[PDB]
Amino acid sequence: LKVEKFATANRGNGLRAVTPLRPGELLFRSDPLAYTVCKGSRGVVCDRCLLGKEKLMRCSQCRVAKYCSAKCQKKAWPDHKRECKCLKSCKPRYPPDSVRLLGRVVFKLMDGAPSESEKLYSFYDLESNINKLTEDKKEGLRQLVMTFQHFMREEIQDASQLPPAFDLFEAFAKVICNSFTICNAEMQEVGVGLYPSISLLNHSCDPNCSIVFNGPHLLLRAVRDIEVGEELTICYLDMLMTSEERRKQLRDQYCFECDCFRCQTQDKDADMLTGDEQVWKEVQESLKKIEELKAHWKWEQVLAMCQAIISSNSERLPDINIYQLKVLDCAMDACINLGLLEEALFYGTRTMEPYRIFFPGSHPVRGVQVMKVGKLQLHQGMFPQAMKNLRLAFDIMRVTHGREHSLIEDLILLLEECDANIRAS
Ligand SMILES: Nc1ncnc2c1ncn2[C@@H]1O[C@H](C[C@@H](N)CC[C@H](N)C(=O)O)[C@@H](O)[C@H]1O
Ligand SMILES: [Zn+2]
Ligand SMILES: [Zn+2]
Ligand SMILES: [Zn+2]
């Protein structure tokens, strides 16, 4: 093990390097203690492997769980067995993701075989911040508790049917500040899970580690050189957020004030907020709907909304503005999913310099973005350009993804195809 739990001065438990670490070094890997497909991806991706398919087969008993294959259906049965009847009874209604997630967790906790996901830190070690919650938040938790009790009612009727140390209210509180959003290879949000060992990592806006998902599986890597004893951190948040926005989310969701170098010095805020507030505020507001559509894989609607914004703001709002940038990114992704590849490259190319600015060093989201643009270029026959970007994507993803991630093999195949096309030209 290259990492260990320790007690920090002022931020609870954390994780630290046992040995010197190099960029790209694998620190930990884990399957989830428990996970579920997220609200917007339900029925779009396989329940088990979280990969999207034109044809998924519904579970016969609930008609809610969907799978890409008989293999996935079977492997998922232990996790699905006790929720099947609960999902069935409430159809077409469907519980919040956290409720479905904790529904799985409670039966997992009764397995006598230790979960690998809990090697460093267990579900019960998870921070709940109970003494820090606002009254409005505690009220929302009590609403969640009631929803769980009703959702689970065919399987569980009383507290005596779960481990004594398990407390439903504190379990929802643990979920708020220890959940991971599982992303597919293209960085679309597809699931949510608990990975208790990985929950040990404290947050920074300039982290020395990063996580990536390959299906439900999580890989933790160093993303720069790290010294013996140094605290290991990850960034909890989207990079395309101002310091005021990050501070709000970290306060509201994680019960802390971020005092990192970036937050203290408003690092990159001026570039993020390029252009006129009266113009970009309208983009920010429009993104609420655009992001929700994207989360539900509604690509035609996303594209329509983004095109309206991109065309109307072209004379006034620069692409480096984070709101304009998010709209370009959504537009690109909508186009890729609809097979509008020339248009996708048009939007993706415009994201390149801002991504270089806002995702410094080695960040998996930038590696994936560069790979997407490289692949589009190769498709469009722009071989020298594609080759530079595919190599750049490799320079990044070798660190952020590593050779244990299946996307690296995919990338190598594109570079070989591009190379062959160059030699043939
Ligand atoms: N940069 C930070 N400054 C202060 N508290 C932090 C920071 N990052 C994480 N935390 C705390 O850690 C919680 C989330 C946990 N996943 C991390 C490990 C946690 N410190 C523990 O003892 O279990 C947050 O909700 C905060 O309570
Ligand atoms: Zn599957
Ligand atoms: Zn079922
Ligand atoms: Zn910060």
Polypeptide structure, described:
It catalyses: L-lysyl(4)-[histone H3] + 3 S-adenosyl-L-methionine = N(6),N(6),N(6)-trimethyl-L-lysyl(4)-[histone H3] + 3 S-adenosyl-L-homocysteine + 3 H(+). S-adenosyl-L-methionine binds at residues 11-13, 121, 129, 178, 202-203, 236, 256. It is found in: Cytoplasm; Nucleus. Zn(2+) 1 binds at residues 46, 49, 68, 72. A zinc finger (MYND-type) spans 46-84. With 425 residues, this protein is α+β, with helices and mostly antiparallel strands. The protein has 5 domains: 1-44 and 180-270, Beta Complex (Beta-clip-like), CATH 2.170.270.10; 45-93, Helix Hairpins; 94-179, Annexin V, domain 1, CATH 1.10.220.160; 271-350, Serine Threonine Protein Phosphatase 5, Tetratricopeptide repeat; 351-425, Serine Threonine Protein Phosphatase 5, Tetratricopeptide repeat (Alpha Horseshoe), CATH 1.25.40. Helix content is 47%, strand content 12%. The chain has 15 helices and 12 strands. The chain has helices at residues 70-80, 84-90, 97-108, 135-151, 168-178, 243-254, 261-264, 269-272, 277-295, 299-313, 322-337, 341-358, 364-379, 383-400, 406-424, and strands spanning 3-7, 13-17, 26-30, 34-37, 57-58, 66-67, 180-183, 189-194, 202-203, 209-214, 217-222, 231-234. The strands form 4 sheets. It has a 4-stranded mixed β-sheet with strand order 1-2-12-9, with no helix packed on it. Strands 3-11-10 form a 3-stranded antiparallel β-sheet, with no helix packed on it. Helix 9 runs antiparallel to helix 10. The N and C termini lie far apart (49 Å). It binds sinefungin and zinc ion (ZN) (3 copies). One zinc ion is lined by residues 205, 246, 258, 260, 262-263. One zinc ion (ZN) binds next to loops.
